[PDB]
C-alpha cells in the first residue's frame, strides 16, 4: 500500500501561476473511450497504437505493452494533443481486457468528498466493468466535481490542495489533484501517473476525495 501524503508534498494551487484551464480540460467532456478494440501498431517498446482517430497508449513498462497487444480490450482515459508523438492523440494506461469483464448493468461507486475535514458532499459514479481502471474512476469523479463544485476553473481553483484516495479491501493508493508548482502545466507529465494501468475491482472499491481551501 502507498503511504499517505507527507506535509507539503501535496501540490498547491496558489503555487501554480499558469492557467488552471490547462488541467480542467483533462477532466472536461472530451476524453478517449473505445470498446472492444485491438492494437494495430507500436511506436516504442512501452506503447500500443489504436484506431478509434489515432490513439497512442503508453504503459510504464514493456510487460504491460506486450500483455495487451493481440488482445481485444476496452480503452478509457484522459488524452492530450500537445507534445504528442507517433514518430492523432496520446494517453497513459486506461486499458482493460474486454472479454469476460463486462456487466450488463452499471455498478455505482459512491464518492465521498470532504472539505477542510468536513463533509462536503457525496455522489455516485457508474461503470459497466467488473474490473475498471482507477484512471476511469478518477476521471468520472473529477468530471462531476468540475461540472458541479467548481473544482477546476478557467483561471484558478478555489481549492488549495486535493487528493483522491482509493481503498479496495485493505490496500489503498492516492493521486494528487493539483498541478506541480510553476507558471506552466504540462499535461503529458501529469497524466504519466496513470501508466502503471492500476485496476480496481468495482464491486469493492471505495473512493474518498480530500480538499482543503486557502
Amino acid at each position, epitope marked *: 500500500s502507498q503511504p499517505d501524503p507527507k506535509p507539503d508534498e501535496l501540490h498547491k494551487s496558489s503555487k501554480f501561476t499558469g492557467l488552471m484551464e490547462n488541467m480542467k480540460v483533462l477532466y472536461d467532456d472530451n476524453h478517449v473511450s473505445a470498446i472492444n478494440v485491438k492494437s494495430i501498431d507500436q511506436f516504442l517498446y512501452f506503447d500500443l497504437i489504436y484506431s478509434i482517430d489515432n490513439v497512442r497508449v503508453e504503459f510504464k513498462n514493456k510487460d504491460l505493452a506486450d500483455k495487451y497487444k493481440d488482445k481485444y480490450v476496452d480503452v478509457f482515459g484522459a488524452n492530450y494533443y500537445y507534445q504528442c508523438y507517433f514518430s492523432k492523440t496520446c494517453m497513459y494506461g486506461g486499458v482493460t481486457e474486454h472479454n469476460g469483464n463486462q456487466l*450488463d448493468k452499471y455498478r455505482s461507486i459512491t464518492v465521498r468528498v470532504f472539505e477542510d475535514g468536513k463533509n462536503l458532499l457525496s455522489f455516485d459514479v457508474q461503470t459497466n466493468k467488473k474490473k475498471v481502471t482507477a484512471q476511469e474512476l478518477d476521471y468520472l469523479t473529477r468530471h462531476y466535481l468540475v461540472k458541479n463544485k467548481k473544482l477546476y476553473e478557467f483561471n484558478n481553483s478555489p481549492y488549495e490542495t486535493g487528493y483522491i484516495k482509493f481503498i479496495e479491501n485493505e490496500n489503498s493508493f492516492w493521486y494528487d489533484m493539483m498541478p506541480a508548482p510553476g507558471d506552466k502545466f504540462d499535461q503529458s507529465k501529469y497524466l504519466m501517473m496513470y501508466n502503471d494501468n492500476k485496476m480496481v475491482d468495482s464491486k469493492d472499491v471505495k473512493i474518498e476525495v480530500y480538499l482543503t481551501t486557502k
Partner: antibody
Amino acid sequence: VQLQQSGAELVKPGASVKLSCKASGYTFTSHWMHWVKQRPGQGLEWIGEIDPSDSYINYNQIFEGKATLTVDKSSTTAYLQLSSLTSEDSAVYYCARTAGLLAPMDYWGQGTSVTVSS
Amino acid sequence: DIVMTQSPSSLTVTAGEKVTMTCKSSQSLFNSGNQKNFLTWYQQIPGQPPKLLIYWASTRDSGVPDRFTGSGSGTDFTLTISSVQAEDLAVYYCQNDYTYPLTFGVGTKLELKR
C-alpha cells in the same frame, strides 16, 4: 428462446427450497440470468443476477442472507436457492434473461409459485 | 437503491382515447458516454410474466405495436398509449434499468371503460 420453470412448489416454514430454470435456443454463457420476486397482487422486486461463464453474481443486499444463485454448465440450468423460509417469502419467483449488455430482460419464465406453510 | 415513483396507480378510460402514465426517478438514469436514458417499461397481464414494451426510454421492442410510445429523460418519463384497446388491460410497470439494484415502480392499473 424458452425459459422452462415449474408451476409451484409447496414448502414448510423453516425449510430451504431450490428453484430451477432450464433454457434453450441461445448458448447459455452468452447472457445474464436475473431473478425477480412478486407477492400476490403486489409489485415486483429484483433479487439478483448471475453470469454463467464465470458465475459472477450481483445480489440485492435485501436478499443476500436469503438468496443463493448458481448455475449448471453441463445442462445449462439456472438455479436460485432460497433458505430458511417464512410467510413473507411466499410469492412467485421468475427467472428471466437479459437481451445482451445494457439491454432489458426480454424473455421470462412462466414463474414458480411459492407457498410457505405447515 | 433508486426509487421509481409511478402514477396514477389506477386509470379508467374508454377504448379509443390517449392515456398518459408517468414514472419519476429519484436519481438520474441518464448516461453520457453512450447516452440513452436507461429506463424500461413493462406490461403485465394478470397471471403471467412481465412483458417488455420499451427499453432506453423510447425504443420499442420488436413486435410491440407502434401505438405505444415513451418520452422524456433524466428523472421524468412518459408512457403514452395512442388510442387504448381491449388487449391493453394490464398493470404497466416502469423499471430502473441503469444501476444495481434494478428497481421497479408500484405500477399503474389500466382499466378499460365501456
